[PDB]
Amino acid sequence: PHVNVGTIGHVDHGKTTLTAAITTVLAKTYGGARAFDQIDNAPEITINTSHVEYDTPTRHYAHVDCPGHADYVKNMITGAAQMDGAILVVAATDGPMPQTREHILLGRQVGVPYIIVFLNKCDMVDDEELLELVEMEVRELLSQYDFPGDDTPIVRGSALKALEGDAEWEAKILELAGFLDSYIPEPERAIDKPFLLPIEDVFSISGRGTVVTGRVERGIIKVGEEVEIVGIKETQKSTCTGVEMFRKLLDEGRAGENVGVLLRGIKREEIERGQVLAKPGTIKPHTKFESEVYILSKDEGGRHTPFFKGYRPQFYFRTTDVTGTIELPEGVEMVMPGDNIKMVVTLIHPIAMDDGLRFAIREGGRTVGAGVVAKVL
Ligand SMILES: Nc1nc2c(ncn2[C@@H]2O[C@H](COP(=O)(O)OP(=O)(O)OP(=O)(O)O)[C@@H](O)[C@H]2O)c(=O)[nH]1
Ligand SMILES: [Mg+2]
Ligand code: NA
Ligand code: NA
Missing domain, CATH: 3.40.50.300 (P-loop containing nucleotide triphosphate hydrolases)
Known part of the structure; x- marks a missing residue:
């Protein structure tokens, strides 16, 4: 314990x-x-x-x-x-x-x-x-x-x-x-927290609809239970027609397991990078939030110059990069490398969010910083 x-x-x-x-x-x-x-x-x-x-x-x-x-x-x-x-x-x-x-x-x-x-x-x-x-x-x-x-x-x-x-x-x-x-x-142990599965990959499988793969971060997904695809666009609702681990057919998806969740009526092209699988009404999608960020220094492999209000980087939430605009605090003119400030982030696409969620700030596929979701707006 x-x-x-x-x-x-x-x-x-x-x-x-x-x-x-x-x-x-x-x-x-x-x-x-x-x-x-x-x-x-x-x-x-x-x-x-x-x-x-x-x-x-x-x-x-x-x-x-x-x-x-x-x-x-x-x-x-x-x-x-x-x-x-x-x-x-x-x-x-x-x-x-x-x-x-x-x-x-x-x-x-x-x-x-x-x-x-x-x-x-x-x-x-x-x-x-x-x-x-x-x-x-x-x-x-x-x-x-x-x-x-x-x-x-x-x-x-x-x-x-x-x-x-x-x-x-x-x-x-x-x-x-x-x-x-x-x-x-x-x-509270993850298996007790409501179902959450970050979609890591997607496939159109033979005679059985669409498979969404990833690791179950919280709870359980039982075969037949209703689900939600929260993220990049408006929330879509499906049903779990099956749970498959490799070639092994299962009826349950437990927290900490890498599974494949078979969905009803959902199509390969309606699934986006950064989207999740959640118990209905347990996670909402947000674009705007308050953050607490730490920007990497030159001797940390980060930026070598400061950034301003017009800065627009990528935010690696769980599985992908999502571009966002920033709002700096009053009296905060710029952010030097190695700095720590609060910042209001405005994402291009909504991401499933709640306070405490971590992200990495990037610039052309390289990490330039890190943050926490202080307050969703
Ligand atoms: N009198 C007294 N001195 C203490 C006590 N606790 C720590 N000190 C002394 O205070 C000094 C600094 O305390 P640290 O344990 O090093 O605290 P720190 O927050 O880790 O900070 P750093 O000094 O920067 O490493 C040391 O010389 C300790 O011996 C205490 O209970 N009584
Ligand atoms: Mg010390
Ligand atoms: Na079913
Ligand atoms: Na991350």
């Missing part, structure tokens, strides 16, 4: 120290352990990121911890962070800083579902009034970006004094680990 988390926060606020403390304390108590030098030196579009593993008696955790702001932007945009919930590290010394807010903002924009707060460097704070002011400031900061500030768990502590061995502070690491179990709910 695996859950994905990460340490989010401002530079030097004690993110790496906390990650090491989490591994060591749960290792002394339940099982395992990693030290600062191991997590600070992060491996690996250059996203430097450490991937840590730790266990609770009830769950398994994959943890992400990055050296600087750049790697948090990159990981949240590119989806690679896979966070089911985040841990915001706030120092009681400094309090919410520029990157604290920017990490909460991006959290709202990339769809990080739950944020738990660890108030670090309490060993260095002697006034209680100071800690309550830093905690209120964080509660205020979370509720601004639609997070449940009043219902958010805020653990007071010292990642370093617990890392060193002081038993009083190891009790706060265990408190944190508890809220990672009680407060992050079990993520």
Whole structure:
């Protein structure tokens, strides 16, 4: 029973120290352990990121911890962070800083579902009034970006004094680990999410209509069930006459399976690149949306010059490129390579969409950036 988390926060606020403390304390108590030098030196579009593993008696955790702001932007945009919930590290010394807010903002924009707060460097704070002011400031900061500030768990502590061995502070690491179990709910498994099949290929087969092939991203497609072809044009409705995996005849199409879905009355020429197969009324097609994009730098194989309002690139949603016009934020004059901005995208063709969906920005078949669907319009 695996859950994905990460340490989010401002530079030097004690993110790496906390990650090491989490591994060591749960290792002394339940099982395992990693030290600062191991997590600070992060491996690996250059996203430097450490991937840590730790266990609770009830769950398994994959943890992400990055050296600087750049790697948090990159990981949240590119989806690679896979966070089911985040841990915001706030120092009681400094309090919410520029990157604290920017990490909460991006959290709202990339769809990080739950944020738990660890108030670090309490060993260095002697006034209680100071800690309550830093905690209120964080509660205020979370509720601004639609997070449940009043219902958010805020653990007071010292990642370093617990890392060193002081038993009083190891009790706060265990408190944190508890809220990672009680407060992050079990993520909904794909087989339970309504049916979604990105059309990867199409064929006109012998005496049995049209076959649509691809990988079932969510739920199940049962033979005889009504379906929808959402995307590039107006939504067409069909019926699943059959499900075929290679030469094996099936009646079910389960999530994570590469199948061939036989459709009724649908013709090879009515199927387009980028279209999907969905449970009726579970996914709608959109052209206009708010985005959170990261543009590749020269030393990342991206653009070597900036782009403006008149920029019109391709947006690789699931299976294909779709040209789109852009709307830059007020006061945003241009986008340099290596930049991170919000942008309103207007696609030529509608794509089946909901918030959280990722895309790649391209220019003549080469990736030049990456984005997230912040809000559909
Ligand atoms: N007093 C005290 N210092 C701490 C605590 N946690 C971290 N520090 C120190 O704060 C410094 C920076 O903390 P880091 O763990 O490196 O935090 P970071 O967010 O990963 O940032 P970088 O310094 O840029 O790598 C280090 O010298 C830590 O020893 C704490 O609980 N108490
Ligand atoms: Mg670090
Ligand atoms: Na049938
Ligand atoms: Na992509």
